[PDB]
Design an enzyme around this catalytic site. Structure first.
Site, mmCIF file in Angstrom:
data_model
loop_
_atom_site.group_PDB
_atom_site.id
_atom_site.type_symbol
_atom_site.label_atom_id
_atom_site.label_comp_id
_atom_site.label_asym_id
_atom_site.label_seq_id
_atom_site.Cartn_x
_atom_site.Cartn_y
_atom_site.Cartn_z
ATOM 1 N N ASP A 22 0.862 -1.181 0.000
ATOM 2 C CA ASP A 22 0.000 0.000 0.000
ATOM 3 C C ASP A 22 0.917 1.255 0.000
ATOM 4 O O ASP A 22 1.794 1.409 0.912
ATOM 5 C CB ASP A 22 -0.858 0.044 1.289
ATOM 6 C CG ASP A 22 -1.685 1.326 1.385
ATOM 7 O OD1 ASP A 22 -2.371 1.618 0.384
ATOM 8 O OD2 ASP A 22 -1.710 2.005 2.444
ATOM 9 N N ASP A 70 1.231 5.138 0.585
ATOM 10 C CA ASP A 70 0.532 6.260 1.122
ATOM 11 C C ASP A 70 1.355 7.529 1.003
ATOM 12 O O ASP A 70 1.908 8.028 2.011
ATOM 13 C CB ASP A 70 0.107 6.005 2.524
ATOM 14 C CG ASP A 70 -0.964 4.927 2.605
ATOM 15 O OD1 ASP A 70 -1.241 4.318 1.546
ATOM 16 O OD2 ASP A 70 -1.496 4.660 3.716
ATOM 17 N N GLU A 122 1.635 11.229 0.803
ATOM 18 C CA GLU A 122 0.813 12.377 1.164
ATOM 19 C C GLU A 122 1.655 13.615 0.928
ATOM 20 O O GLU A 122 2.343 14.061 1.866
ATOM 21 C CB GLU A 122 0.377 12.302 2.654
ATOM 22 C CG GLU A 122 -0.665 11.161 2.894
ATOM 23 C CD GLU A 122 -1.177 10.989 4.326
ATOM 24 O OE1 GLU A 122 -1.505 11.986 5.016
ATOM 25 O OE2 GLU A 122 -1.307 9.810 4.725
ATOM 26 N N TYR A 146 -11.594 11.862 5.053
ATOM 27 C CA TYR A 146 -11.516 12.280 6.457
ATOM 28 C C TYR A 146 -10.421 13.330 6.538
ATOM 29 O O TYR A 146 -9.819 13.642 5.521
ATOM 30 C CB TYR A 146 -11.280 11.097 7.436
ATOM 31 C CG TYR A 146 -10.263 10.120 7.004
ATOM 32 C CD1 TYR A 146 -8.925 10.446 6.959
ATOM 33 C CD2 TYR A 146 -10.645 8.813 6.656
ATOM 34 C CE1 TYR A 146 -7.954 9.503 6.538
ATOM 35 C CE2 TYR A 146 -9.700 7.874 6.252
ATOM 36 C CZ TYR A 146 -8.378 8.236 6.189
ATOM 37 O OH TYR A 146 -7.504 7.297 5.836
HETATM 38 C C1 LIG Z 1 -0.180 21.317 4.524
HETATM 39 N N1 LIG Z 1 0.216 20.334 5.603
HETATM 40 C C2 LIG Z 1 -0.348 19.060 5.531
HETATM 41 C C3 LIG Z 1 -0.031 18.106 6.481
HETATM 42 C C4 LIG Z 1 -0.621 16.845 6.375
HETATM 43 C C5 LIG Z 1 -0.288 15.869 7.332
HETATM 44 C C6 LIG Z 1 0.590 16.132 8.399
HETATM 45 C C7 LIG Z 1 1.164 17.396 8.505
HETATM 46 C C8 LIG Z 1 0.861 18.367 7.537
HETATM 47 C C9 LIG Z 1 1.457 19.610 7.633
HETATM 48 C C10 LIG Z 1 2.357 19.839 8.688
HETATM 49 C C11 LIG Z 1 2.988 21.092 8.803
HETATM 50 C C12 LIG Z 1 2.729 22.102 7.865
HETATM 51 C C13 LIG Z 1 3.360 23.355 7.973
HETATM 52 C C14 LIG Z 1 3.073 24.353 7.012
HETATM 53 C C15 LIG Z 1 2.179 24.122 5.948
HETATM 54 C C16 LIG Z 1 1.568 22.869 5.851
HETATM 55 C C17 LIG Z 1 1.830 21.854 6.795
HETATM 56 C C18 LIG Z 1 1.170 20.601 6.666
HETATM 57 O O1 LIG Z 1 2.071 25.264 5.167
HETATM 58 C C19 LIG Z 1 3.310 25.941 5.418
HETATM 59 O O2 LIG Z 1 3.513 25.638 6.842
HETATM 60 O O3 LIG Z 1 -0.991 14.760 7.007
HETATM 61 C C20 LIG Z 1 -1.126 14.896 5.606
HETATM 62 O O4 LIG Z 1 -1.509 16.311 5.487
#
Ligand SMILES: C[n+]1cc2c3c(ccc2c2ccc4cc5c(cc4c21)OCO5)OCO3
Ligand SMILES: C[n+]1cc2c3c(ccc2c2ccc4cc5c(cc4c21)OCO5)OCO3
Length: 570
Positions: free
Chosen positions: A290, A292, A294, A370
């Site tokens: 799988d 993942d 992201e 989700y």
């Molecule tokens: C946009 N995002 C998505 C995320 C995310 C996660 C886990 C953490 C983040 C994340 C963590 C810190 C961040 C810090 C940031 C940002 C975006 C993020 C950020 O924009 C600039 O400053 O599970 C998948 O989706």
């Protein structure tokens, strides 16, 4: 006429041997800790304390000769190799020119990672998980997390396995750039740095070898000499109890995705794909992979990464290349291997990948329906709604309007239905899509009545920050709470609200919430009613089934409702 050998059990590692050689008492690089051998190395000491020792020995497993060698005294060590996992009745015979004398038989164990040496696992499942007779063609999946064995205290034997078709095991990291893991604090980055010492970048490793294979589990009958312990030995025994259950490692996830952004370089994919083939030849209880990531295009934990021109094509090529590799494994083993992926479903995630192209190589897409809203900002919303909620503005649902500053919506709102529709519109077949259910809520504080624009809907308010709580109430990180915690401490037995919380349900969205008006604590989650709606939706559209995230947070109610929703949708 020699004396019959007596086997020295303690000098022969208690007759516990293994095709896989695993460091049980240190933490070091993956390649130093784990070595899979085509033939197990066997070493058996035997004694002939009285009489004559004779001059040669033969070793038999179930009556078949497997080794011979010289006896030259009253103590002999028989070392040899054997290629097949299992339990066997071993006898060792000593011979001289007048005849042979055979030891009494004793069981020897040759461990292999398919669990061929193990009995079916004994289950200890909360009886709130009911029995169902759901069509076996319907996907009913869940994630089981490696770290759930610590504070959460949720082990493999606790899973309601007869209610599951697919267990995704979260998460397998990839060596290389992992700045996002550092940002999470705790020991997660240090563990990964150790696991990757002596490992090439872009290859997979086990993140926590103590959880995965070292920890002794009493309920699984693990003892000191057991050559495979931890979650993985329990998953191997689980496959003995449930041979049709698919167990799939999930590579990546929100915090471990940083290395995927280098898969625009084919050499990095080749390294990764080769390491995944080796991982599946090492850990044979696993039935596919799988992915993942992201996310392709960015927008995930790595703020400085994401390439919307190249990540999509790289993801498709990765899927094509993994499928090529998996076909080689299918040729080599006679087994079926599944290739799946969990994917973001906001329109800005979807638009960066041609999934209709990628999915031709895949068995299923796990739609992450989700995390649409959450504690990362102060804007409440339904994190796991099927449809657009009453709190949304005119034109916000389909993205044809403007926000409260008058700024144009850039695309359709984050809802399960908008995501699924976007994927169907690209030409992804419905029977490849699996719809996700949350076994947790996300939450805010400070959403008090004075912030609401509609006095009966807390989704119209504004928060001051993430929900805070203790691990006793199922809050393992700020802004997130186990479904079982919500049920115990916010809903209560009658589902009407306890401890200053009230329950509400947005019928247009198909989304529940609980709200404490005085603390302004507000939690968005999936409940029995929204999960039945998701089941009916899945049925209507002919989706592959449902999956959930994550199984340790449920008390039975969510998985039961997944089964109930899939029986009864009109
Ligand atoms: C946009 N995002 C998505 C995320 C995310 C996660 C886990 C953490 C983040 C994340 C963590 C810190 C961040 C810090 C940031 C940002 C975006 C993020 C950020 O924009 C600039 O400053 O599970 C998948 O989706
Ligand atoms: C989706 N986001 C947007 C963010 C963001 C920020 C800062 C942080 C985040 C963030 C942080 C943690 C997250 C964790 C998550 C997540 C999303 C996020 C997340 O979904 C899965 O778990 O300024 C720009 O916009």
């Amino acid at each position: 006429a020699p004396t019959a050998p007596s086997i020295d059990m303690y000098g022969s590692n208690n007759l516990q041997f293994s095709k896989i050689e695993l460091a049980m008492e240190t933490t070091s690089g993956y390649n130093d800790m784990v070595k899979y051998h085509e033939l197990a190395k066997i070493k058996v000491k035997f004694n002939q304390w009285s009489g004559t020792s004779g001059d040669t020995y033969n070793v038999y497993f179930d009556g078949v000769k497997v080794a011979t060698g010289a006896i030259t005294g009253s103590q002999t060590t028989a070392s040899f190799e054997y290629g097949q996992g299992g339990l066997y009745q071993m006898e060792i015979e000593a011979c001289d020119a007048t005849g042979c004398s055979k030891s009494a038989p004793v069981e020897i164990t040759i461990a292999d990672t398919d669990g061929s040496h193990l009995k079916p696992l004994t289950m200890n499942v909360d009886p709130n998980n009911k029995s169902y007779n759901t069509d076996p063609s319907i996907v009913m999946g869940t994630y089981f997390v490696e770290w759930g064995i610590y504070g959460r205290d949720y082990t493999v034997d606790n899973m309601p396995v007869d209610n599951l078709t697919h267990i995704l095991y979260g998460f397998i990291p990839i060596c290389g750039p992992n700045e996002s893991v550092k940002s999470v604090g705790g020991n997660s980055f240090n563990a990964l740095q150790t696991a990757c010492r002596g490992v090439n970048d872009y290859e997979v490793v086990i993140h926590d070898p103590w959880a995965a294979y070292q920890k002794s589990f009493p309920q699984a009958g693990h003892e000191y000499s057991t050559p495979i312990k931890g979650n993985y030995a329990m998953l191997m025994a689980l496959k003995q109890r449930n041979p049709d259950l698919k167990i799939i490692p999930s590579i990546g996830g929100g915090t471990l995705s940083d290395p995927f952004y280098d898969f625009v370089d084919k050499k990095n994919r080749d390294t990764f794909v080769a390491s995944v083939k080796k991982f599946l030849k090492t850990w044979k209880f696993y039935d596919g992979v799988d992915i993942d990531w992201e996310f392709p295009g960015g927008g995930g934990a790595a703020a400085d990464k994401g390439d919307p021109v190249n990540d999509g094509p790289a993801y498709i090529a990765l899927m094509r290349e993994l499928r090529v590799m998996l076909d080689e494994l299918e040729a080599e083993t006679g087994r079926t291997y599944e290739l799946t992926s969990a994917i973001g479903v906001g329109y800005d995630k979807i638009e960066d990948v041609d999934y209709a192209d990628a999915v031709q190589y895949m068995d299923y897409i796990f739609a992450m329906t989700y995390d649409f809203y959450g504690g990362w900002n102060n804007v409440p919303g339904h994190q796991t709604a099927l449809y657009c909620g009453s709190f949304m503005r005119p034109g916000q649902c389909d993205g044809g309007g403007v926000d409260e500053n008058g700024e144009p919506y850039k695309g359709p709102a984050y809802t399960a239905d908008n995501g699924i529709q976007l994927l169907l519109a690209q030409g992804v077949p419905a029977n490849k899509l699996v719809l996700g259910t949350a076994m947790y809520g996300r939450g805010w504080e400070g959403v008090t009545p004075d912030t609401l624009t509609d006095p009966n809907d807390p989704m119209t308010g504004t928060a001051t920050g993430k929900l805070k709580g203790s691990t006793a109430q199922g809050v393992w990180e700020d802004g997130v709470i186990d479904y079982k915690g919500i049920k115990s401490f916010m809903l209560g037995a009658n589902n009407t609200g306890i401890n200053g919380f009230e329950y509400g349900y947005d019928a247009q969205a198909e989304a529940p919430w609980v709200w404490n008006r005085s603390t302004g604590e507000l939690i968005t989650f999936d409940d029995h009613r929204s999960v039945l709606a998701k089941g009916n939706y899945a049925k209507s559209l002919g989706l592959a089934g449902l999956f959930s995230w994550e199984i340790d947070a449920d008390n039975g109610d969510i998985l039961n409702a997944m089964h109930e929703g899939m029986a009864g949708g009109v």
